[PDB]
Amino acid sequence: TDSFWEVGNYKRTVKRIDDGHRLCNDLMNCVQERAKIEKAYGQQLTDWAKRWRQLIEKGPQYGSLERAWGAIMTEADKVSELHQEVKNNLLNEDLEKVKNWQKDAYHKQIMGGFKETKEAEDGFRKAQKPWAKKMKELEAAKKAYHLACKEEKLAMDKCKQDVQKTQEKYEKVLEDVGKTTPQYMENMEQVFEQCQQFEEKRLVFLKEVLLDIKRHLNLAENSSYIHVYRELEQAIRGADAQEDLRWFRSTSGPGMPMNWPQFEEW
């Protein structure tokens, strides 16, 4: 009853066509939303780097340790930058890739749906029509047979002569679907198969696009990411306690020059 082969149930295959277009929509929003998220994190990082760069500067921390601490603000700028690159790929490549695929792939016609949906719809309607008509008729038949046996019940007459003519109409219409069935089957097989081909393009494209996206997301492949931490670490390792102590000593402590009191005149 639910089977493809019953009248009208080819519609699921048709519905699927409409679906693909919408599914391009869904994916495009998916990416945009993702990019928004990356954008927010890069943004919040630069704001932070900017806060702290300024607070370290203005503040009493001095020396190489001021610079080491400052370096973290340098990672936050770099990382921020990588996330903005992610956002820009997501948006400029992948979304535009999908936008383009959809545009060239579905055609709004007039009205009034996509052209690729209607072609399928018309193909199925044409493949199912003789058959659908035979199927209504075969239907009408059985009951007239289901109407001439049961009839024999009370009057049991032109009764065994009306079994013998509704039974043969029925039997003959039956014989005749038997005959139209393999064409009816060949014909469905074709529209359907043209539908698989279209859907296959879309799915093949999807798989490619997902991969594009994985790549634009994978910060941890890229050398730059691995490098910002190689570089942060060595900057901190650069800081010397003893260095800043000596610096304070000579610029602010006992190491400063003094003009020791002498004799004066005038």
Q: Please report, as residue ranges, which positions from 216 to 245 form the binding site for a second copy (by CB under 8 A).
A: 217-222, 225-226, 229, 232-233, 236-237, 239, 241-242, 244-245
Residue placing its CB nearer to a second copy in the complex, 110 or 239: 239
* Cα-based torsion angle of the residue sequence 29, 33, 35, 40 in order, rounded to the nearest 10 degrees: 160
Q: What is the closest distance, in whole angstroms, from the C-beta atom of residue 94 to a second copy in the complex?
A: 11
Under the binding rule (CB under 8 A), the answer on residue 194 touching a second copy is: no
**Contacts with Ca ion, residue ranges (CB under 5 A):** 59, 61
Residue placing its CB nearer to Ca ion in the complex, 23 or 177: 23
Candidate segments 1-9, 87-95, 104-112, 116-124, binder of a second copy by CB under 8 A? 1-9
In the set 7, 8, 37, 103, which binds a second copy (CB under 8 A)?
Answer: 37
Of residues 46-85, which lie at the interface with a second copy (CB under 8 A)? 48, 51-52, 55-56, 59-61, 63, 65, 68-69, 72, 75-76
Task: Give the interface size with a second copy as a residue count (CB under 8 A).
Answer: 99
Of residues 83-112, which lie at the interface with a second copy (CB under 8 A)? none
Under the binding rule (CB under 8 A), the answer on residue 8 touching a second copy is: no
Q: What is the closest distance, in whole angstroms, from the C-beta atom of residue 70 to Ca ion in the complex?
A: 9
| From Ca ion, a second copy, none, interface partner of 129 (C-beta below 5 to 8 A by class) | none
